[PDB]
Amino acid sequence: SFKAQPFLVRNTILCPNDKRSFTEYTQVIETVSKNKVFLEQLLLANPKLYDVMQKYNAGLLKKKRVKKLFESIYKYYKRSYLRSTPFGLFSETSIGVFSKSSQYKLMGKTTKGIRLDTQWLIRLVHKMEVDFSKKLSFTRNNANYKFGDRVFQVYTINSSELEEVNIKYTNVYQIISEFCENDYQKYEDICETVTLCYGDEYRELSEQYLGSLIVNHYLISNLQKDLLSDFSWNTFLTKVEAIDEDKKYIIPLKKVQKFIQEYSEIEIGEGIEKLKEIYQEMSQILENDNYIQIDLISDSEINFDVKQKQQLEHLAEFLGNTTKSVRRTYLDDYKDKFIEKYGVDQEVQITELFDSTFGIGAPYNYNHPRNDFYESEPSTLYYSEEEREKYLSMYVEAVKNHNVINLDDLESHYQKMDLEKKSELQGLELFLNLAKEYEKDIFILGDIVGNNNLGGASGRFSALSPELTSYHRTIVDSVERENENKEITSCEIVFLPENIRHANVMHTSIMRRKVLPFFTSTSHNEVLLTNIYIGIDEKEKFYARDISTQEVLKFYITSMYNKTLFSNELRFLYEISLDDKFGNLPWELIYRDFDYIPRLVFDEIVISPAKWKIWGRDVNSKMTIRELIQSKEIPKEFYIVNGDNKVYLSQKNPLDMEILESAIKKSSKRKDFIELQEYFEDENIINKGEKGRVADVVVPFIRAFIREKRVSVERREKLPFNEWLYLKLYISINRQNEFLLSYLPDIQKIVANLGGNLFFLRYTDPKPHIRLRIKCSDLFLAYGSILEILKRSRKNRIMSTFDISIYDQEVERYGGFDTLELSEAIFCADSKIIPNLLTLIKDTNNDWKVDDVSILVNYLYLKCFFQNDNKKILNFLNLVIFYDKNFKELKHAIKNLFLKMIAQDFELQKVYSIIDSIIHVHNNRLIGIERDKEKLIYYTLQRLFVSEETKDFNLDLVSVSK
């Protein structure tokens, strides 16, 4: 069911057959200093470490910082021959395909894919902005959003890393931001727009107010347009020309462009001096740690079998199926918190949603920022207990027998299980290293494993050649077409990363219909952040909508950027645009604490290499570091895993055993461990000049749309002693009935005397309590009269405390405010009669029971609503009178609502939803917290009908920490 696409092949430039072992560090520096390819590789990747090695080979590098130079150069040597991961001059990227026969020779030719350093370039533009503000034009930053009397940003940039800044919302800010919304405006024009409405005596205030907006990036200049996204040398230069009077930047910049173009055509290794020039010009313009990005691409075309294509598709099936056991996630708990605050009939503006005071904050696992209210970790189920038992069992088995762990043992388990079988998972990208064992070619999953972000790995390389652009577009096309059918608008989120040294990773080509910019600007169609609303669909899944066009959105970060470094809102928009199930393989979660893990395999694929944990506390004194790793049986060759980089180490190499001793005592300082993996021969499969290359691959594998805008607090919240009085009476479940029987009647009478009405509700959340809501002329007079009764209920220990709370009306849920009022009329009339049914159920001398009264009043409800019908009643019933008493009141109120519903052409769908509620809140009053027995009373009721058929220039700037 998973179909493997053509794939990226990444392989190293040097060949590991030319690697040589070293025994002395000084010895390394010389072989390296005579290695032409290596020296250019280092000058490009890491200019500052490069200059330090020059300072070495010219006598005076201060001899305290010599070892660090050593350790670094050795690791860079290792990284240059081993380790296939794409990065400037070290290794190259190419397209692979499937055919009827394998092909591993690289016949094609190598290109340089050159980019400015994004951190350099951004720093430059900010230099120019400060110089030429009055000659530029500025637009509004989409990151801005008004909240109350303040103007926030989703995140802050110009900071020195600690502070988040917000300003006050003033007339001046309004004029300026409205004037620059979806528009650029020369500095001068902005200034006048405010003076043409304030006076010319205020020109000076304007110039600095505007000055402040540009400094704290509430306004971005025309220079930042397409700077990151679809950068052009020519449009960049044109823009700079017009503003650069003294030719201070334009002349040096063209030399840089010229040299880069010259550098482009040079071979790899015989280009060090041309590169030296390139830094020199750029260094003079502005120093940065790095100046140039390079992505090596290539003409080659590696081929895989048909046995290989199935083998990979088999693995994609298996990995996908394990998700079937993800029952409950952090987003699910988030979804639940959403449903309790907002109804199920509300779309909420996303900045409001994520506010921890006016909304509900973020998911438990989110960190930017983490919630500041207290919360305990939500229950999450990522695999079943039965499954966890099998996994631990397979583990102790494999350890005891000194064997591999065979994951395929559970393949049937995952395929035969489907339950609700929707196939939520839409596609994968796996990351596989190529290697050998016992002279046989094998796949090895990286620690990376992969993810469900199609296009993720290719997005960076897409713009480097039309064959790549074509490749990207095809991978992306799966999701894009499935979006076309469901009439969903896609958006790339395009942003200036908070941490500016992460800028080079943001990069990708926009393949989506629109764009969400942050601290930047593009030519694509852009969504405003404050137009984004979040709702929940009929099957209870999050969705985003642009309220201004009513379109539905899915958002994309089509890159290898860490998806957890985003502000909460951005992370959310991403995550609801995928399936929430891939990410937590069971074996990773279950085996993580063990200090030895067997190799994990699946159908001859190595799922994970064997892993070791080595602890500081174990090197002892009569137990050497070498003797220790032999005691735990680490092989001659192995990796140490720092993060997402591993370094090759050999037990037989003296330098390497040093590296190990260094690593083990830095973790020692921290009461920590160090991670080892076993090694695979990975040097002789992909070849070029009859020499092997280290290689990895990345294989991609492939209705009531209503919903009301959330109504404002001012219209929806009914404050104490306005129209309503709302009390939370804390009463234990065992005693609520007695309160309703023997206390409520008195209360109802008091409120009757004042010609008002009341309805109540039963709740469990916080602690058990009854929610009283009273509508009446003199509310405070009513409170005082109630209070005596409450005092008695406290005295008898029926009720502990109470609160007087704001009544938050469920407007959206019950139609308009109009339909709401009549619903409330039903609530009261229903409340009015409940003590009577309860008296009645309680009575022994005859009848009834509870569940009879339940079934009977739902029926009375349905008859009333649908006018003694049955075809109307049954069609409603398939998705889910005679006694006088006070039912005259209830029937009457049900009547008025049915009439007003019909009077305003409520759709059938709206009417059912509203009706279900009225029945639901009745069930709440009559009997307790009811769950799915709601649908059983509905299920039971089918049968019965079946059988019948001036200082606003202030900018009060504030900063917070973290």
Add this chain to the structure above:
Amino acid sequence: SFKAQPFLVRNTILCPNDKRSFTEYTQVIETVSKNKVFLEQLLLANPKLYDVMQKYNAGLLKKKRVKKLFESIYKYYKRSYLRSTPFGLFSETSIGVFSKSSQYKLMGKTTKGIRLDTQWLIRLVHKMEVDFSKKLSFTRNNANYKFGDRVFQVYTINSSELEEVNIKYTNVYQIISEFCENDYQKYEDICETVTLCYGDEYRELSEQYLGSLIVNHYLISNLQKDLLSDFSWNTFLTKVEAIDEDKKYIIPLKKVQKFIQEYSEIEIGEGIEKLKEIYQEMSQILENDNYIQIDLISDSEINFDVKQKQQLEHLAEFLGNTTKSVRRTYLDDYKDKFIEKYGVDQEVQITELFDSTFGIGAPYNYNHPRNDFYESEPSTLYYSEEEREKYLSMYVEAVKNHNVINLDDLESHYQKMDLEKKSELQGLELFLNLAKEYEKDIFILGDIVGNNNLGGASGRFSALSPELTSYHRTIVDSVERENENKEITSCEIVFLPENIRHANVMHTSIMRRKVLPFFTSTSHNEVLLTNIYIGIDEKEKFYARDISTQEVLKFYITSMYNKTLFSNELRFLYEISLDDKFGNLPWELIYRDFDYIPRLVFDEIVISPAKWKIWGRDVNSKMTIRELIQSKEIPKEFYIVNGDNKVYLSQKNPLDMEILESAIKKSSKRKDFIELQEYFEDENIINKGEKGRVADVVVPFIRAFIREKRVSVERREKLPFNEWLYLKLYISINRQNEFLLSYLPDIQKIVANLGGNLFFLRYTDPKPHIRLRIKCSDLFLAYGSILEILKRSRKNRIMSTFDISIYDQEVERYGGFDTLELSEAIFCADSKIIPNLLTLIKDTNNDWKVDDVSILVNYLYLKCFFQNDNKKILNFLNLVGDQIFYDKNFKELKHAIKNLFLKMIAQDFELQKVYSIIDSIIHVHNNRLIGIERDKEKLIYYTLQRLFVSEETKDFNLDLVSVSK
């Protein structure tokens, strides 16, 4: 540090050398039905099963209960030869001692320790109550307690169901119970007491209400006095005489006593016919599933080495030391919930404490009421992350190498740890089986392992012989002497178990100064439940106090009754009287989920045998149960462990393999597992007639209480719009200051004009909010006026919602209500000045930051309290610019600080109370001025030291209700 006492020896009566193998079940049933000793053993231990076996080999047993009868009888056969655990006619108890040499021959003679069946006896006595009421006298059940308009019992018994029952609190119940509260009262006199203030026309109602009180066990009769606890045949018999005119009960009971007394002198095996008499006699009186308890005791005297005394004491040190790593428990979390509700200056009545509506519920782990409000599992540290890493490491090491796990690897670690602390742990009882491996004598800990309950194992056997009574009293003597030193009054909790079929286990003989009775009564001095109040030490530790005598109490259940089957309140009283640390060995917790655990060892003691988990789900096709236990390398002999019973099995025995196959498919359908353990040869160490006995042993090893009774809800809670108006204003932390700057002043001005006062406070949990408290004449006018300001703060999105809540005054913390009022005056004056300090800090032109203003106000508070006397101020501190002093509201503050100080001096507050109050008052100023993240606060004290150093009719109702538990 642990010194081993004389120990209990428990050994089997039969000898395992005379055990025999069987091949088919019918072969067992026949061998058994002609085995003299087994039949008397069976007739005593399990009467209904005996009759099922009789019904079987006489044709009459329905052929579905045949399999059950078969397995059951096999296991009881195994259990009579194997299994040293003490229990009627199967095995016997004796005292063991240490000397200079081992001695394993049992020389003594075996005696019967016979007791009636407690379920039999109590059920009988309950009938007599219903029959002979008017001829009896009654006392109040201590389990009773008033709460509001109801009368509950901490648990219910007359439940022959799963229901808990409570009645209405009526004037009649009050009269009857206060009358019967401290002693017994003739049926007649209770009745008069009711009619003498209701009328003689109510006599008929009195008789009925009183009855229903007895029916539902709200009252105990004089029959129950010492019934369970210190039962005497004659004091019991005499009482029955006085009420039984028709001699319907007395004549058979005397027969029962005579038959039992005759049974006593009979040997083991030769009594089947005498027992049958006892059953027939007692069954005619009252049928029950069991009739007779027997605890076999013996004068024998097994001896252990001096190497053995070290070996055990070494093990006790090690086990005890591991508790050193228990940092935080479920009781530690509860202690914290206590302090959040009540603070530290309150003693709370235990029934209120445990109420989930009016109190704080129970500890997280309690289940007799598990809490009904939602709660997430508390953080607990029973071992460190480093320790856990070590155990896992040792686990993977041992499995990979097919070795034992040597707990010795960490003896050095636990021993050298935390030498500066005294260990709360005052003693252990360890439970050890005796066995061999490679012909060498070894100790093996039970899975039970043991506990920190001294006297637990001996309490049951205590009354059976003067040598036993002496032995028990000696173990208990440690605890009891130390209780005397600390001036602590001890209580045994004496109770009829909720599950009336557990009746026989409650039994222990009373060694403590008082007794806390439930559904029974004794002759000792008794504590009332509703007199027990709970407080906290200066050292943050729970204690119990009898409010009527001001005594401090520690509580004891000196038996083997499962300490988790108690009502919460009872469980709590038990557990706070011990260390909260022993019970969770780290390896037990950490290895718990592995479906193979290696043998755990320590100094030649086997701490735990190797354990296996075998699953139903794994017997499918080509995989037979025998093939399965072979693949997991189950040894030839092994135990299957159901619960507190293990059954012996051998792979070479066909029947044993049948038992197993049955065990696994009963687990299959429920999709769970079965537990196996390795076997140790254990039959020929302790001997009698030159034949071995299966044996285990159980070895025991060895200030200002102020605090106010909690002020009542009615007296402490100030309802909305009476004297006070209280708003919870929900405002984010980042913007609270701003609110205090540009909104509170307007509010303060509103309430000012109405001639009242307000004080505020910052809180963080639930969600951040400011607690506003206003005192004023016309509160509802003040609300409406304020309300506009608040709506303006909503608009600006500074405040989201607010609540109007009940103000729970902190009386105890701030002295009486008198000193409270005066503190409140300070709270308000202090609140008045915070907007200026905040402006003054917000002002750039100052150069006064937050921490400068802080110390200056902290300094000024102290100059006030101790009237500029720098030397007193320093003494206070040693247990832990001008524009402000001239500021109009700081003068108000100074006055208020003075007025409190006067009343404090006037009421002879102990010096420490005063220090404490000041500290609180200073703490809440800090709260108002700056946030609430703390202890960088007591840093304010340290620096402030520097500044002062450097200045040198229908209420007969019984409205009975039932709940569903």
